[PDB]
């Protein structure tokens, strides 16, 4: 991945190794030059999410203003579990409504 | 007067019945569209075609 | 142990026993006064002349061929009189002691922490031609609310 | 409005709550802390930090005009105090749990009868017929800001609270006895306390 | 009752009002009375009506 | 439907995820990142003008 | 923020910093507090991982500081009050420092030795922005009141 680099932590510009024929990153500040990490370079993406695990409801159990389930806390163990959805501006991000136990925090999904 | 505004007692039981009997018609929507079984279309969207 | 509704009122009646209506108005001025203002004059009390604390003075009147008698509204008002009191800020020039000089006049808000009434009992509000229902909130500048 | 000084005294000092840097990699996150928008501090377990603040308003050790926020979706803990806020005196619940099983009501009939002992007043000193002017000094009613609402969950009528408490263990509803009235939303969607 | 072509809008937060959970896409809350100007209206309702 | 889908903008709306830039020296470079690759090799094997 | 002209360039973000004068790319101001070196600047905004998406948008942002490039020039590109004055450098530098202590985020602290505090806020500000263009939340509501 495109990072900085030791010495003078700074941006890293791309640079091919013609002769050799391999990846190689570098910076415009100093001279440092490290090998590549993958053929990939830049990606577009028109948008298809941006949450995956939205780490991590680690503050849902203490959210007096939230709903709760009843028993069935996959793994861990115990009853009572807070849930909730996402809904961001546009969609249609269906409603991957998730959950979290009060005595744990296992983001146990569900259909 | 008011009397002209107060529906029959018997026939008012049947009012409150067809109202609370349309809760069940939302229950089967608030929870059935959490299992992605709407669906939507047209005009969109999916959240809106639910509101609809 | 259960709690009934007729009780809630018996609670919120207490709120209006002390807090009363217009309480804050009326209070956002009861704090001016002393208050935060003596520090704002100190933010720019410089001049190649320094400004000190300011003596708090009750609303009075001074006039020609007359004398120094404090105001007693609303027996004022109709004299189209503005209802203010004088400011007195200790100025520094050096002779140890300050100077207690007058700096314009500031219009007071009826029924305040520093008003002519504040802690006056109903039976004594009448004597003054007032009305136990007035809740302050207003100024009587130039004779009109 | 209340002074913005003695407020940080109860924050930098407690606790621990460290200022300065503390950023590269670790801390965040590790949530942060604004006050009047003035983000001086990082602080870790917000847990202990909040409950203990809120109990400062219930004893009045601090001005009762102070709001508190716990945005568990954006992190942060905004703490306003500057004048211009709006309030709205509510009742509370305080659920630990600890006393009285789980809930519930934070006032007792006792309290009320005591209130009435002052309507018959005056007739004493200060002291001072604790008539509301103290009902906050005793952590009974909290004034809520407009932005404080977001993080709170108020009830409408005690009846609703009683019904929810009975459900927490399964208790008949009795909806075939009520007569022409404001048909409430029964029973109570989730919401445990 | 309505408003700009969408039952009582949310905000603040993800809720119609502070007497409700979150994601309460139910009528028992979002603008929607069950009684008439006879019983008639309930607090949690009275407001919804006034703002429509 | 012949026409329904015979008069629409279309263009690059099916991609929307998307465009990636990979640097590959020799005309026979890849990696992945998935499967493919095989298809590319088959296209080169048919050396019908590769050199050109 | 800007994000138009598919020809110019790659969606780049700026600032104003009242009460004068124009637009001033972001990196320019971090480099005017105590954080000139790159990487560290992004640490105040986002936190890898990362999440390059939210960061990427920086590319065009940094490029705007590809000339800064230290502390001298930074304060330099600030000569525009105004009503025709200066002459030129030294003076300009002085004005820049004054601004950083009264104009640049006037609350917090107006002392002298507290430029490391205003270094994060900007990162915090622009943290929010990124959350919206990437479509990660929703634009705050001016309805409040609240
Ligand atoms: Zn370098
Ligand atoms: Zn569990």
UniProtKB/Swiss-Prot annotation, chain A:
Binding site for Zn(2+) 2: 73, 76, 101, 104
Protein's GO biological process: maintenance of transcriptional fidelity during transcription elongation by RNA polymerase II; transcription initiation at RNA polymerase II promoter; transcription-coupled nucleotide-excision repair
Gene3D superfamilies in the cross-refs: 2.20.25.10
This protein's record includes keyword rRNA-binding: no
UniProt GO molecular function: DNA-directed RNA polymerase activity; nucleic acid binding; zinc ion binding
Residues that, per the record, bind Zn(2+) 1: 5, 8, 27, 30
Keywords, alphabetical: DNA-directed RNA polymerase, Metal-binding, Nucleus, Transcription, Zinc, Zinc-finger
Compartment list: Nucleus, Nucleolus
Chief subcellular location: nucleus
Pfam families linked to this entry: Zn_ribbon_RPB9, Zn_ribbon_TFIIS
UniProt-listed CDD domains: Zn-ribbon_RPB9
GO cellular component, one term: RNA polymerase II, core complex
Keyword Thylakoid attributed: no
InterPro entries: DNA-dir_RNA_pol-M_15_CS, Rpa12/Rpb9/Rpc10/TFS, Zn_ribbon_RPB9, Zn_ribbon_RPB9_C, Znf_TFIIS
Zinc finger (C4-type): 5-30
Annotated spans, Disordered: 52-72
Family statement drawn from the similarity comment of this UniProt entry: Belongs to the archaeal RpoM/eukaryotic RPA12/RPB9/RPC11 RNA polymerase family.
Subunit structure as annotated in this protein's UniProt entry: Component of the RNA polymerase II (Pol II) complex consisting of 12 subunits.
Protein name: DNA-directed RNA polymerase II subunit RPB9
Lineage: Eukaryota, Fungi, Dikarya, Ascomycota, Taphrinomycotina
UniProtKB/Swiss-Prot annotation, chain C:
Record's function text: DNA-dependent RNA polymerase catalyzes the transcription of DNA into RNA using the four ribonucleoside triphosphates as substrates. Second largest component of RNA polymerase II which synthesizes mRNA precursors and many functional non-coding RNAs. Proposed to contribute to the polymerase catalytic activity and forms the polymerase active center together with the largest subunit. Pol II is the central component of the basal RNA polymerase II transcription machinery. It is composed of mobile elements that move relative to each other.
Misc: The binding of ribonucleoside triphosphate to the RNA polymerase II transcribing complex probably involves a two-step mechanism. The initial binding seems to occur at the entry (E) site and involves a magnesium ion coordinated by three conserved aspartate residues of the two largest RNA Pol II subunits.
Annotated protein name in UniProt: DNA-directed RNA polymerase II subunit RPB2
Family: Belongs to the RNA polymerase beta chain family.
Subunit organization: Component of the RNA polymerase II (Pol II) complex consisting of 12 subunits.
Subcellular location: Nucleus
From Swiss-Prot, chain F:
Protein name as annotated: DNA-directed RNA polymerase II subunit rpb1
Top-rank lineage group of the source organism: Eukaryota
Sequence similarity: Belongs to the RNA polymerase beta' chain family.
Written domain comment of the UniProt record: The C-terminal domain (CTD) serves as a platform for assembly of factors that regulate transcription initiation, elongation, termination and mRNA processing.
Role: DNA-dependent RNA polymerase catalyzes the transcription of DNA into RNA using the four ribonucleoside triphosphates as substrates. Largest and catalytic component of RNA polymerase II which synthesizes mRNA precursors and many functional non-coding RNAs. Forms the polymerase active center together with the second largest subunit. Pol II is the central component of the basal RNA polymerase II transcription machinery. It is composed of mobile elements that move relative to each other.
Post-translational modification: The tandem 7 residues repeats in the C-terminal domain (CTD) can be highly phosphorylated. The phosphorylation activates Pol II. Phosphorylation occurs mainly at residues 'Ser-2' and 'Ser-5' of the heptapeptide repeat. The phosphorylation state is believed to result from the balanced action of site-specific CTD kinases and phosphatase, and a 'CTD code' that specifies the position of Pol II within the transcription cycle has been proposed.
Range covered out of full length: 1135 to 1186 of 1752
Subcellular location: Nucleus
From Swiss-Prot, chain G:
Subunit annotation: Component of the RNA polymerase II (Pol II) complex consisting of 12 subunits.
Function statement: DNA-dependent RNA polymerase catalyzes the transcription of DNA into RNA using the four ribonucleoside triphosphates as substrates. Second largest component of RNA polymerase II which synthesizes mRNA precursors and many functional non-coding RNAs. Proposed to contribute to the polymerase catalytic activity and forms the polymerase active center together with the largest subunit. Pol II is the central component of the basal RNA polymerase II transcription machinery. It is composed of mobile elements that move relative to each other.
Note: The binding of ribonucleoside triphosphate to the RNA polymerase II transcribing complex probably involves a two-step mechanism. The initial binding seems to occur at the entry (E) site and involves a magnesium ion coordinated by three conserved aspartate residues of the two largest RNA Pol II subunits.
Record's protein name: DNA-directed RNA polymerase II subunit RPB2
Protein species of origin: Schizosaccharomyces pombe (strain 972 / ATCC 24843)
Entry's family note: Belongs to the RNA polymerase beta chain family.
Subcellular location: Nucleus
Gene: rpb2
Domain of life according to the entry: Eukaryota
């Amino acid at each position: 991945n495109f990072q900085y680099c030791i010495e003078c932590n700074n941006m890293l510009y791309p640079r091919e190794d013609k002769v050799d024929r391999v990846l190689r990153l570098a910076c415009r500040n100093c001279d440092y030059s490290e090998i590549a990490a993958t053929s990939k370079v830049y990606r577009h993406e028109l948008q298809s999410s941006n949450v995956e695990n939205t780490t991590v409801s680690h503050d849902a159990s203490t959210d007096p203003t939230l709903p709760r389930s009843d028993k069935e806390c996959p793994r861990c163990h115990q009853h009572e579990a807070v849930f909730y959805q996402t809904h961001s501006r546009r969609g249609d991000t269906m409603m991957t409504l998730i959950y979290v136990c009060v005595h744990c925090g296992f983001a146990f999904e569900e259909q | 007067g008011i009397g002209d505004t107060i529906a029959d007692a018997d026939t008012m039981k049947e009012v409150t019945r067809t109202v609370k009997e349309a809760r069940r018609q939302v229950a089967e929507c608030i929870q059935d569209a959490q299992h992605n079984r709407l669906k939507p279309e047209p005009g969109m969207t999916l959240r809106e075609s639910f509101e609809a | 142990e259960t709690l009934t509704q007729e009780d809630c009122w018996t609670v919120i009646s207490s709120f209006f026993e002390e807090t009363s209506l217009a309480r804050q108005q009326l209070f956002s001025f009861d704090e001016f006064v002393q208050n935060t203002m003596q520090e704002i004059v100190d933010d720019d009390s410089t001049l190649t002349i320094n400004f000190g604390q300011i003596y708090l003075s009750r609303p009075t009147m001074t006039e020609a061929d007359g004398s120094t008698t404090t105001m007693f509204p609303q027996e004022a008002r109709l004299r189209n009189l503005t209802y203010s009191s004088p400011l007195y800020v200790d100025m520094r020039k050096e002779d140890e002691e300050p100077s207690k000089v007058f700096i314009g006049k500031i219009p007071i808000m009826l029924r305040s922490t520093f008003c002519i009434l504040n802690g006056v009992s109903d039976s004594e509000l009448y004597d003054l031609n007032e009305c136990p229902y007035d809740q302050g909130g207003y100024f009587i500048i130039n004779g009109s609310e | 409005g209340s002074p913005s000084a003695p407020i940080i005294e109860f924050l930098e000092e407690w606790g621990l709550e460290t200022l300065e840097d503390y950023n590269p990699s670790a801390s965040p996150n590790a949530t942060k802390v604004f006050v009047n928008g003035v983000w001086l501090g990082v602080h870790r377990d917000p847990a202990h930090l909040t409950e203990t603040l809120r109990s400062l308003r219930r004893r009045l050790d601090i001005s009762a005009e102070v709001s508190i926020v716990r945005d568990i979706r954006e992190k942060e803990l905004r703490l306003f105090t500057d004048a211009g806020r709006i309030c709205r005196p509510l009742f509370i619940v305080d659920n630990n749990p600890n006393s009285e099983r789980r809930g519930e009501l934070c006032i007792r009939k006792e309290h009320i009868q005591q209130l009435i002992e002052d309507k018959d007043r005056y007739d004493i000193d200060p002291e001072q017929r604790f008539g509301w002017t103290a009902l906050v000094s005793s952590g009974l009613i909290e004034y809520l800001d407009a932005e404080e609402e977001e993080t709170v969950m108020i009830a409408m009528s005690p009846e609703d609270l009683e019904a929810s408490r009975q459900m927490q263990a399964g208790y008949e509803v009795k909806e075939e006895l009520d007569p022409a009235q404001r048909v409430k939303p029964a029973p109570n969607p989730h919401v445990h306390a | 009752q309505i408003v700009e072509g969408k039952r009582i809008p949310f905000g603040f937060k993800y809720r119609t009002l502070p007497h409700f959970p979150k994601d309460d896409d139910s009528p028992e809350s979002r603008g929607f009375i069950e009684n008439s100007y006879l019983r008639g209206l309930t607090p949690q309702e009275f407001f919804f009506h006034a703002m429509a | 439907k012949n026409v329904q889908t015979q008069i629409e903008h279309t263009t690059l709306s099916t991609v929307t995820s998307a465009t990636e830039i990979h640097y590959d020296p020799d005309p026979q470079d890849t990696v992945i990142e998935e499967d493919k690759d095989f298809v590319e090799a088959f296209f080169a094997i048919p050396d019908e003008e590769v050199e050109e | 923020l800007m994000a138009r002209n598919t020809e110019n360039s790659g969606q780049t973000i700026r600032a104003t910093l009242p009460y004068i004068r124009s637009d001033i790319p972001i990196v320019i101001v971090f480099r005017a507090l105590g954080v000139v070196p790159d990487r560290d600047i992004l640490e105040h905004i986002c936190y890898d991982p990362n999440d390059f998406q939210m960061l990427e948008m920086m590319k065009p942002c940094i490029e705007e500081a590809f000339v800064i490039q230290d502390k001298d020039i930074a304060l330099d590109y600030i000569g525009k009050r105004g009503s025709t004055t200066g002459v030129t450098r030294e003076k300009r530098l002085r004005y820049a420092h004054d601004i950083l202590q009264k104009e640049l985020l006037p609350h917090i602290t107006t002392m002298e030795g507290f430029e490391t505090r205003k270094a994060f806020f900007l990162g915090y500000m622009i943290h929010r922005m990124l959350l919206c263009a990437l479509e990660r939340r929703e634009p705050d509501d001016r309805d409040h009141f609240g």
